[model samples]
Target: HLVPRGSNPPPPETSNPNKPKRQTNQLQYLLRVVLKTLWKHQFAWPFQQPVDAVKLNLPDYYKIIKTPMDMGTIKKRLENNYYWNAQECIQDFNTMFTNCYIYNKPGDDIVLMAEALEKLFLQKINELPT
Candidate 1:
């Protein structure tokens, strides 16, 4: 008769503080969905890429906006897991819009687009689950 094989041992428990929890994963996924929706908006074109001061002929843009933010950069950050929480992502959006308001004139096309996009952004964020 053949000897019986020994049962396999249970895997060791490996816990890391840096690892995201299940709730964090769900929130991150929701944030991505919100960002995608904002990116698809018509008014999103102006904010899609980072502002090029040289190309746009606004040399003082960097001076005025010390912290420049854009949808593309935000998207990249999310993809790279740079955001630790929803507020960080939301703060970036606020910074992007604030920079727009600061650099552009009130009635300008870019400002108008920023206003619309900001409104949409707030709406989408409020729709997220508690």
Candidate 2:
């Protein structure tokens, strides 16, 4: 036999009251994509040479969107650590807007896409070192 329930069932569990806001995985993915695209455009000089990129084991994020942008590769190079944080990628995404507009006429939905991408970094996702 079970006893009768009390007026209040139970209080919800709480962890950190001051928990830090985090960037979303989607935002990180977007960051990864743009980094790859920028490298393709020679944004990073060292990455311009295939031999250098291969020597560093750095892959262009754009071409490998179908592939995983694994963070495991970051430990080998100090310069590569920039890819670990999504906050640092905001300007890159903004640049993405301008470039796509210049290269191919962007549609009205492009702004929405930008907003959604921003939301991934600024609001919804938990921030972590990728």
Candidate 3:
């Protein structure tokens, strides 16, 4: 099992609506790989999948790497059962691609992988939850 790494994301001092700002080039890269993994396994989890995978219409997911990341706000919204529209979910794919990251933890990285899984499957706004 993997330890929490003392703070996988390293908690923010205040609630900033931006995550990319805190992400380093290395973090961003690994995050990109992880995000891609999320996009792939979206229909694998227990969530109900549409009969026709081709007909699935869902909001694009993004890994934010800029500053002022509103993770705390986003979390709160989820906690309160927030309803998400298309715009606020994730707007740019480059925002994720442009970033860089490194994975130091071997298989232990599964913990982080699970995080991505949670993001997809747990989101109330998700149409094709994994």
Error of 3 at 52 (Å): 42
TM-score of each model, paired residue for residue: 0.77, 0.25, 0.23
**What are the Cα lDDT values of the candidates?**
0.75, 0.36, 0.31
> Model 2, residue 47: displacement in angstroms?
20
Per-candidate clashes come to 0, 8, 20
Please give the TM-score that candidate 2 achieves against the real structure. 0.25
Candidate 3 lDDT over 45-73, as tens digits, reads 32212111123221111222332222333
Best by TM-score: 1
lDDT of 3: 0.31
Higher-TM-score candidate among 2 and 3?
A: 2
Q: Clashing residue pairs in candidate 2, if any?
A: 22-125, 22-126, 22-127, 23-125, 23-126, 23-127, 24-125, 36-61
lDDT leader: 1
The TM-score of candidate 3 is 0.23
Residue 117's lDDT within candidate 2 is 46
